[PDB]
Amino acid sequence: SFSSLYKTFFKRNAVFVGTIFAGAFVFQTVFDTAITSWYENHNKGKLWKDVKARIAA
Amino acid sequence: AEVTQLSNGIVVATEHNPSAHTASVGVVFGSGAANENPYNNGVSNLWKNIFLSKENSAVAAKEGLALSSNISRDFQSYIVSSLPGSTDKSLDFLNQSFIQQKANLLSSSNFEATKKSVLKQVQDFEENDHPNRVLEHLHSTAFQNTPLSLPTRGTLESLENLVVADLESFANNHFLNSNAVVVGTGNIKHEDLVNSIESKNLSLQTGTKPVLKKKAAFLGSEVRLRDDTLPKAWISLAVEGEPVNSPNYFVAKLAAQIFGSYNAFEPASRLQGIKLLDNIQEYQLCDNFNHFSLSYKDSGLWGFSTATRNVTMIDDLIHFTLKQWNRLTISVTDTEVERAKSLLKLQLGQLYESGNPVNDANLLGAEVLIKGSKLSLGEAFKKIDAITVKDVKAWAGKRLWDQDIAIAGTGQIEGLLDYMRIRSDMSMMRW
Amino acid sequence: AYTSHLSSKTGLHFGRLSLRSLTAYAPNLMLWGGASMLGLFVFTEGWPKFQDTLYKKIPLLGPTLEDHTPPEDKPN
Amino acid sequence: VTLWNVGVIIFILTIATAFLGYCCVYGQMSHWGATVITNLFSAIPFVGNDIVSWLWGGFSVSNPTIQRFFALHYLVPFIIAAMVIMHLMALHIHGSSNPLGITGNLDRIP
Amino acid sequence: MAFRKSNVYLSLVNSYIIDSPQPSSINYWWNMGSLLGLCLVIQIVTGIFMAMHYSSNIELAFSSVEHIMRDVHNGYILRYLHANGASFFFMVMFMHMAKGLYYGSYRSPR
Amino acid sequence: PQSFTSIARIGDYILKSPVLSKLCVPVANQFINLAGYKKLGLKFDDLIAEENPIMQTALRRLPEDESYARAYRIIRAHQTELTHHLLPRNEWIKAQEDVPYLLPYILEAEAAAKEKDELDNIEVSK
Amino acid sequence: PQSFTSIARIGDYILKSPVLSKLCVPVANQFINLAGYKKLGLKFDDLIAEENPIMQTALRRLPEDESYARAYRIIRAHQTELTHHLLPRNEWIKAQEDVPYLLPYILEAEAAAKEKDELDNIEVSK
Amino acid sequence: KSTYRTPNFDDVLKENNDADKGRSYAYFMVGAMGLLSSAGAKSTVETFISSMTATADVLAMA
Amino acid sequence: PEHDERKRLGLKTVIILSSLYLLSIWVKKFKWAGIKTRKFVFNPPKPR
Numbered sequence A: 001s002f003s004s005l006y007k008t009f010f011k012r013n014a015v016f017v018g019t020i021f022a023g024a025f026v027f028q029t030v031f032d033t034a035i036t037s038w039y040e041n042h043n044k045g046k047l048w049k050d051v052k053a054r055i056a057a
Numbered sequence B: 001a002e003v004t005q006l007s008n009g010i011v012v013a014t015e016h017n018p019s020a021h022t023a024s025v026g027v028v029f030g031s032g033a034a035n036e037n038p039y040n041n042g043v044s045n046l047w048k049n050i051f052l053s054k055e056n057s058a059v060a061a062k063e064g065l066a067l068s069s070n071i072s073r074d075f076q077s078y079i080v081s082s083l084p085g086s087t088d089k090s091l092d093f094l095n096q097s098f099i100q101q102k103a104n105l106l107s108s109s110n111f112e113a114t115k116k117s118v119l120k121q122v123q124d125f126e127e128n129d130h131p132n133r134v135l136e137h138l139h140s141t142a143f144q145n146t147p148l149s150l151p152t153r154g155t156l157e158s159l160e161n162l163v164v165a166d167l168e169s170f171a172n173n174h175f176l177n178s179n180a181v182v183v184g185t186g187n188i189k190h191e192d193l194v195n196s197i198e199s200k201n202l203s204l205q206t207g208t209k210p211v212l213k214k215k216a217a218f219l220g221s222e223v224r225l226r227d228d229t230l231p232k233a234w235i236s237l238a239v240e241g242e243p244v245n246s247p248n249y250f251v252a253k254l255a256a257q258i259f260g261s262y263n264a265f266e267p268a269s270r271l272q273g274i275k276l277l278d279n280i281q282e283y284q285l286c287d288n289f290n291h292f293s294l295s296y297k298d299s300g301l302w303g304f305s306t307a308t309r310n311v312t313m314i315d316d317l318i319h320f321t322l323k324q325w326n327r328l329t330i331s332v333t334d335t336e337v338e339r340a341k342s343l344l345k346l347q348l349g350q351l352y353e354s355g356n357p358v359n360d361a362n363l364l365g366a367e368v369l370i371k372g373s374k375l376s377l378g379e380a381f382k383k384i385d386a387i388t389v390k391d392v393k394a395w396a397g398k399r400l401w402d403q404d405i406a407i408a409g410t411g412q413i414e415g416l417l418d419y420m421r422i423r424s425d426m427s428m429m430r431w
Numbered sequence C: 001a002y003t004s005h006l007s008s009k010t011g012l013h014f015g016r017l018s019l020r021s022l023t024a025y026a027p028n029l030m031l032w033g034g035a036s037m038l039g040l041f042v043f044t045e046g047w048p049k050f051q052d053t054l055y056k057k058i059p060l061l062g063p064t065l066e067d068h069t070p071p072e073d074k075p076n
Numbered sequence D: 001v002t003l004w005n006v007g008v009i010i011f012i013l014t015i016a017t018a019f020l021g022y023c024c025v026y027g028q029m030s031h032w033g034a035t036v037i038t039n040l041f042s043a044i045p046f047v048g049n050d051i052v053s054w055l056w057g058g059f060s061v062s063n064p065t066i067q068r069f070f071a072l073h074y075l076v077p078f079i080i081a082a083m084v085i086m087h088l089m090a091l092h093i094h095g096s097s098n099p100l101g102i103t104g105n106l107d108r109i110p
Numbered sequence E: 001m002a003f004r005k006s007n008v009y010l011s012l013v014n015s016y017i018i019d020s021p022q023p024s025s026i027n028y029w030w031n032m033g034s035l036l037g038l039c040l041v042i043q044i045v046t047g048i049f050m051a052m053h054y055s056s057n058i059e060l061a062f063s064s065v066e067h068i069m070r071d072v073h074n075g076y077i078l079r080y081l082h083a084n085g086a087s088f089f090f091m092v093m094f095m096h097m098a099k100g101l102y103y104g105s106y107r108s109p110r
Numbered sequence F, G: 001p002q003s004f005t006s007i008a009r010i011g012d013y014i015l016k017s018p019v020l021s022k023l024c025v026p027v028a029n030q031f032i033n034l035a036g037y038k039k040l041g042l043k044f045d046d047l048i049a050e051e052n053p054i055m056q057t058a059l060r061r062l063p064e065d066e067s068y069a070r071a072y073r074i075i076r077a078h079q080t081e082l083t084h085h086l087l088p089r090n091e092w093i094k095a096q097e098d099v100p101y102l103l104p105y106i107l108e109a110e111a112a113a114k115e116k117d118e119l120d121n122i123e124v125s126k
Numbered sequence H: 001k002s003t004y005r006t007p008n009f010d011d012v013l014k015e016n017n018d019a020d021k022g023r024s025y026a027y028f029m030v031g032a033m034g035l036l037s038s039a040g041a042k043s044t045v046e047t048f049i050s051s052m053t054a055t056a057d058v059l060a061m062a
Numbered sequence I: 001p002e003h004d005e006r007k008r009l010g011l012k013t014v015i016i017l018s019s020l021y022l023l024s025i026w027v028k029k030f031k032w033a034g035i036k037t038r039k040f041v042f043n044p045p046k047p048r
């Protein structure tokens, strides 16, 4: 089942660079939101939204 | 019109062309120069030159015969061409001096003289026959460490340690009766042939040749024997092609005939229907090139073999013909397909029909050994004209787009860029 | 039978190209057009007009681009 | 035609840097010519105001536009110099013409 | 012949960065020149995009540098890339010179 | 830029029809002697641009005497344009010796290259 | 940069004297074995810089077998330093076969060039 | 040693010389490098031309 | 004031660049696998 994968993805270069660009789209967006979610959960209570909810409650 | 009958042992194959003169009876074995190990190599060429020696040829010439032999990479042949009214003489000579006792052929005077002449002509072939030796090095590096890699003539280092024990062991292990096919071309009828093979009892052995452990697998490789003494630069690159009795065989020969063969000094080969000759004719990038398609029993090659006096622009010739190879997959036309169809029909007709009845004997023996019965010239022509452009595009996407190549060079080939550029110029980014 | 001539005729060309070139090239050239539009799709994701017009109308990747800041916490 | 196209590229870059140099002196013709040229450069339908407030660096011709225009007025002549080198290469690989149209390879002068 | 060897600019780019025959046994110390070229292009690019905001008076030099550091978008990135790529430029240059005077490439043909 | 077969076709059709001939060739003769390439001592087929492949083969197929006379006329035109004079009245190319000498070679060379271009774009009936 | 006749006269004065030979030849042997050019499969006469004219004439005057073996040893050194390995213990150049095969040719070439530059600045009796 | 007998490569080779499997593996690796470098090149180009937009004091006094 | 955004973009950039460094080491070893493992054989030629 590797011949079908090679035929539909890496045979012609146009679908190769199109796959690379669409993967760049979805990778950049989910990588950005995942790394900012981790960076804002590693600091809990130190961010401004947490301080604002703390002084609002 | 090409009739085949299986007897008690042997398979008889014949074709009766009643207008030809010299009828030619011989036996074609199915054990060539790829059915041995690399240490007893050249025993097939040594057997051929033992059969063609002075003793045997004087015995055959006193009666009115003329011996022939041809060693290839899976079949080897022993042909006794003769006059048409004299073929029972051919048959009982081939019985009495090759199939039964060979003690007159295999004593240490005739064998010593034959081995010395074979050593001299093999080293003369190695020094002074340059395109055939790089086709041979292409075969030796394409299928390496695997029994199709062997030299046909044999190497010098594995030919000076051969005695009569090697030849007797090879004649016991490969000159069998479930391995042999007797052939008749020229103007012998079929039934007098088998009548004379069944009157006098002719059977070599009974057993079966040893089957090989390793099948022929392509390994994408590279080799260069750069000798800058030589005035030219003989390189040849080739991919894995389709073997014999494969469905994509005639499309491989047609895709070879698409690009054809060329000769830069004849004014009638400079005007062909190739698109490559508008790229390689303004700086004279080569002297000749020929696109072969060899198909052995297990696998085969597909590529071109050139010669270049302009040793600085070697990489441009390689790059231009490889872009022309990628044109097979992406944008091959239909007028190239029909031109190659007619030219392939012409080439196969020039190969199958010719004046010499020993080449027809070799081809008939090979394609009755491997297939079982000979397909005619009509069915081959029908299978040729049943080829559409999309079959060529499918085969070229199967076996030519970004596949591993093997290169073999000699001469002044520093201008040949090294391997990864040539490998990754087999696939372009769609222009 | 016997063919006395060649019953064949020229194609449609402009010297450098022809119709047989563009007929065999056109699926890969429309794929190259799609790949080029995808390339500048990913190259202009930070452009806010294409961001709020097109790059949130994507079904499930949509709410990852916007981040919900209350309006009483920005300087402008 | 390589020489002619590279010359047209130098012509475009020269018009550009002369415009930027005229708009970095900041007189009355300078500022108003800059804002009229970019205000007609905001005629592109989808991205016009976006690219013109990216080019202004603000909301009209002001201090960031003048600093930007001085930096570009340096920078474009040192692209023009490399384009002049390319102009000279594209000339030198074919030789100059002569005011007759006939070939010059017969009688030449160092 | 090929178009990358026929066209005059592409023949230069070909003969310098495509099929320039490099010796077969060079190690990772010979890549410092490519690193120096990349870092020089980095210095020039970040310098232009900082000089679009830097004003060079005596009352505005340090204030304009800390205006780049605080108010322009991603200006901290540009100033730290310039001020640290200069140090990395000189360290890769010291490695280039020390390779050149260790491996004997000051010698008779260069 | 324009093929000489097309120029020859339009010129033959203008020439061998008697209504257009007596209207078109006098203004053509006046345009030629107003152009002034004969005052420098030149035939017309030196003026053609020699940087096409068609013109290069049509020059390499030229005979050995007309090639040397052509090179001399080009060099003499170069020199008398250098000194910003004209050739004297004895050394002007007369109208009867403004014979097209390069034009058969140009026509047959462009016919050969044209036939190659439409032989390799041919299609069999499918 | 240093001519080989100078190195030759210094080395022959060191070797033919008794008190310096057995006190400077062991440290020279240990220096050559510590340099490690033999582990790559190289004699010393491959290590010499070639971009002199003297070394160019001395390499064109080499016999046609030693030139082929020298090219093979240089290419094998290039490859076995490309792999960042060393040659195996059976293919190291032994100390018995580091003979100078190039030094007579370089000595005759530099003697010829020294005689040429000595003859070009000759002074007859004044 | 003959010139047709190749030296051993059986340590640097693989057991299954499949065309599609090895080619797909190599092209997936070069495509992953191209994907990461494409996202990086996009982000650094939009960094460099996001520097040239309106500075925060101009957006404040808008 | 650039502390939070600087360390966040640093995390992004060094993750992307270290993954690119590992993938580029792999593609360098792939492109040089044909050069690290070539073998030279020299038999001495016959004299003329």
Ligand SMILES: CCCCCCCCCCCCCCCC(=O)OC[C@H](COP(=O)([O-])OCC[N+](C)(C)C)OC(=O)CCCCCCCCCCCCCCC
Residues within 6 Å of the ligand: A010, A011, A012, A013, A016, A017, A020, B402, B424, B427, B428, B429, H027, H030, H031, H034, H035, H037, H038, H041
């Ligand atoms: C501008 C100078 C500073 C910037 C300078 C940047 C560095 C110098 C320019 C590098 C640009 C690289 C472009 C590569 C072009 C190309 O041919 O890509 C094809 C590759 C795969 O190609 P392949 O490995 O040969 O395989 C093809 C064989 N098949 C699979 C068809 C069987 O597919 C891929 O490579 C995947 C796509 C990766 C996209 C490239 C990422 C970097 C883009 C930079 C673009 C810069 C150019 C902008 C021009 C306005």
Ligand SMILES: CCCCCCCCCCCCCCCC(=O)OC[C@H](COP(=O)(O)OCCN)OC(=O)CCCCCCCCCCCCCCC
Residues within 6 Å of the ligand: C043, C044, C045, C046, C047, C048, D050, D051, D054, E073, E074, H041, H045, H046, H049, H050, H053
């Ligand atoms: C490898 C490539 C080399 C060539 C580089 C040039 C090509 C660039 C293509 C476009 C890149 C993305 C643009 C959006 C990013 C952005 O503009 O940012 C988003 C900004 C606002 O940002 P913010 O303040 O909300 O951000 C806060 C957090 N950073 O909106 C704008 O500025 C609107 C104006 C658009 C400016 C770019 C328009 C094109 C300029 C010329 C480019 C040359 C094109 C040449 C084509 C032949």
Ligand code: HEM
Residues within 6 Å of the ligand: D003, D004, D006, D007, D008, D010, D011, D080, D084, D087, D091, D095, D096, D097, D098
């Ligand atoms: C910065 C500006 C320019 C410089 C320094 C420059 C330099 C030169 C030089 C030195 C020559 C050779 C001398 C000559 O042949 O006349 C030349 C020739 C030429 N330039 Fe330019 N040039 C510039 C702009 C242009 C422009 C704008 C064009 C037109 C688009 C152009 C088109 C040409 C042409 C066609 C020639 C060839 C003339 C011939 O040989 O007949 N140049 N240039």
Ligand code: HEM
Residues within 6 Å of the ligand: E040, E043, E044, E046, E047, E048, E049, E050, E051, E054, E065, E068, E079, E082, E083, E086, E089
């Ligand atoms: C040879 C390459 C270059 C080097 C080594 C270099 C080095 C430096 C250094 C060390 C500084 C001081 C940074 C600090 O304050 O610590 C600096 C400042 C500066 N450089 Fe460069 N520079 C180079 C090229 C350029 C170029 C070409 C420009 C203009 C386009 C430029 C623009 C600036 C500016 C505007 C400053 C001001 C202070 C700042 O904002 O950093 N640089 N340079």
